[PDB]
Scaffold this active site. Structure first.
Site, short mmCIF file in Angstrom:
data_model
loop_
_atom_site.label_atom_id
_atom_site.label_comp_id
_atom_site.label_asym_id
_atom_site.label_seq_id
_atom_site.Cartn_x
_atom_site.Cartn_y
_atom_site.Cartn_z
N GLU A 39 0.82 -1.20 0.00
CA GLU A 39 0.00 0.00 0.00
C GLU A 39 0.86 1.25 0.00
OE1 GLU A 39 -3.76 1.26 1.59
OE2 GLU A 39 -2.74 1.72 3.49
N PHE B 240 5.41 -6.20 19.35
CA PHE B 240 5.23 -7.65 19.43
C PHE B 240 6.19 -8.28 20.43
CE2 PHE B 240 6.22 -12.03 17.96
CZ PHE B 240 4.96 -12.59 18.19
N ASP C 211 -7.29 2.93 8.48
CA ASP C 211 -7.80 1.85 9.33
C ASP C 211 -8.14 2.44 10.70
OD1 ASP C 211 -6.58 -1.54 10.08
OD2 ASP C 211 -8.25 -0.37 10.91
N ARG D 169 -11.03 -13.74 11.34
CA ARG D 169 -11.20 -12.76 12.41
C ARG D 169 -12.32 -13.27 13.30
NH1 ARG D 169 -8.76 -11.07 14.35
NH2 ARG D 169 -7.21 -11.76 12.79
#
Lengths: 351, 351
Positions: free
Chosen positions: A22, A72, A100, A191
């Site tokens: 993107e 993470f 988002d 999801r």
DNA sequence: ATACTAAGATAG
DNA sequence: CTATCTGAGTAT
């Protein structure tokens, strides 16, 4: 007029990851606008220059693609840290691309200062003081403000249909008629929650030949609330520039509803689907007012409707081609506005 | 009938490595069948001919020992590449020995074409088009078809107990009564998840003097999902074909479960343990239907069943011998039927 | 140095 | 949850 675009929390190299592809496609479409733009990332590459080898103040506009700031396994993520180090050194306004809802601009320092490796960074190094303007992909700027009510250096909010870069790309091409081999196709990932419910609803036990491509694995659908017997076939992921040809292999491609998009964000998938040779069937919840296509036939509310609509399509080649020509006509009306789109973007980054 | 056998991704020279030994031992057992076989690999050697000096189409049968395509360090892997170029030029059916569920046949081209060094190869020289016949070591041919779904030229499947090459070797000899210095013994390396779980359930906090040889250390076990107080003794690696000689040191050798083999693959291990002076105890999951030996005494469920059985063997030098005598009679009955095995192999490679 | 490793981390 | 992505560490 030198513009710099970076991804706030992801490495940018090739098209093998969503955030990276993107960022590159954004760089490519901004370039095609007649603007001089670079992509700064962790290292020198085919599309990027290194954070270490440029002075952020050699650019007049800094565009930052939203990303998450979560570390993470509590380990240092150089993609996040290096990007923010770069942002902190910028002495001008920052343009944050909000694509988002789950990724509003956020300072990393707070989440770093209480880490075992905190000594590696200082607040002056990571704390971003520049004013920030949010370019929201979601038309509802109220939601955009809400998600950012946590950061006070955000001072402007503006709506801009960023995801339209897929249809405004110079090399954009409509899918051509294709030999069908699937009734319905859907690309995505697994999801839990309402997302699992929605997928079992439209993709499982339909009695139709359905393919679920992407990152989902059959065995991720275990919740007893949303049981099933016959699952769709799962497939590995596919290149960004292949999505429309992948969708085109089916009579119908589905757009499922999602609490983070519904009636607010138009997504990349909408365009990828609308551009394929697959008839675009949309979950009513995703677009209640039918902003996408002003024709009820393109919408479904449940499994019965999806099954019924798809069977009407697999028998009637005439009905299929007509619906297909209508969605392509709508796409092109949007494409015809390219120049307005490009000017709106220049206008969004104060050019 | 000229037969050529190659290892797809490992170099073959001598018995200094696992894969090389397997290929050479497979080679020898086939030669002992009175067949004309040649091992083709990177360089000419006592047991091998070089890929670059032979013409693959001179052979009537091409046998390929399964392997994986892993380009370490992103660099070209000459064994995989030479092998696949050899296979690509072959014009008849290929026989792929599937001895590990983890090593399904795989094309390397899709992997190579996107490498920076892709220009060193062409799809014409790497794409294997010949039909493939998977000869699975596992008796569940559905698990084998499932693994080779990605590929398309794999037309046939057939079960054949390949691991038996060790016992049918004109060399084979049972281990003679050994002085016991260990109650339990087990070889191998640790992996993760349930692999570690099991290894702890059967070799830790038992109170028995257990030994663990191979690629494994003590600290490598951290997962707080399977806690331990007293760990066994780790003896690291030993030679590469003295496992039977090693196992005979204990009173009993252990065979623990594994999601890959359970009720499917009989491994080399089974036969090397069944041939030792050590009583072979088996995890009930590895072989539930009790194919290996028909006697409940050789099987265990958990740390309880284990320690208990090992005690019964320690407190009964008579029981030990009886069971030990049982497993040897089984191996002996398998070895006597060597001709049935050989002929079964020939029919496998369509002879 | 030389040769082998049956691949571990990541995506969403 | 594994198909996909990345790209040298371990044993001699």
């Amino acid at each position: 007029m030198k513009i710099a675009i970076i991804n706030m929390g992801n490495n940018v190299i090739n098209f093998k990851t969503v955030p990276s592809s993107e960022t590159i496609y954004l760089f490519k479409v901004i370039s095609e606008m007649g603007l001089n733009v670079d992509i700064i990332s962790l290292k020198n590459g085919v599309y990027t220059k290194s954070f270490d080898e440029v002075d952020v103040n050699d650019y007049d506009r800094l565009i930052v693609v939203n990303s998450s700031i979560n570390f993470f396994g509590g380990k240092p993520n150089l993609a996040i840290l290096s990007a923010q180090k770069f942002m902190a050194k910028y002495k001008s306004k920052i343009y944050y691309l909000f694509t988002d809802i789950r990724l509003p601009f956020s300072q990393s320092w707070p989440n770093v200062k209480n880490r075992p490796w905190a000594y590696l960074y200082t607040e002056e190094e990571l704390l971003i003081k520049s004013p920030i303007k949010v370019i929201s992909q979601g038309i509802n700027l109220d939601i955009a403000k809400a998600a950012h009510k946590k950061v006070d250096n955000v001072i402007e909010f503006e709506y801009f249909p960023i995801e339209q870069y897929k249809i405004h790309m110079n090399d954009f091409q409509l899918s051509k008629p294709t030999k069908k081999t699937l009734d319905v196709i859907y690309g995505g990932s697994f999801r839990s929650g309402q997302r699992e419910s929605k997928m079992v609803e439209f993709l499982f036990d339909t009695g139709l030949n359905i393919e679920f491509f992407g990152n989902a694995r059959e065995k991720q659908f275990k919740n007893p609330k949303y049981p099933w017997t016959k699952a769709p076939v799962f497939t590995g992921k596919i290149p960004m520039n292949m999505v429309s040809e992948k969708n085109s292999q089916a009579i119908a491609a589905l757009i499922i509803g999602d609490k983070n998009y519904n009636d607010n964000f138009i997504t990349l998938r909408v365009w990828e689907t609308m551009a394929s040779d697959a008839v675009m069937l949309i979950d009513e919840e995703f677009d209640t007012k039918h902003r996408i296509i002003n024709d009820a036939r393109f919408y479904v509310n449940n499994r019965a409707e999806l099954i019924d609509r798809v069977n009407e399509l697999k028998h009637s080649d005439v009905l299929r081609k007509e619906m297909l020509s209508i969605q392509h006509d709508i796409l092109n009306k949007t494409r015809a506005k390219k120049a307005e789109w490009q000017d709106a973007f220049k206008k969004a980054i104060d050019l």
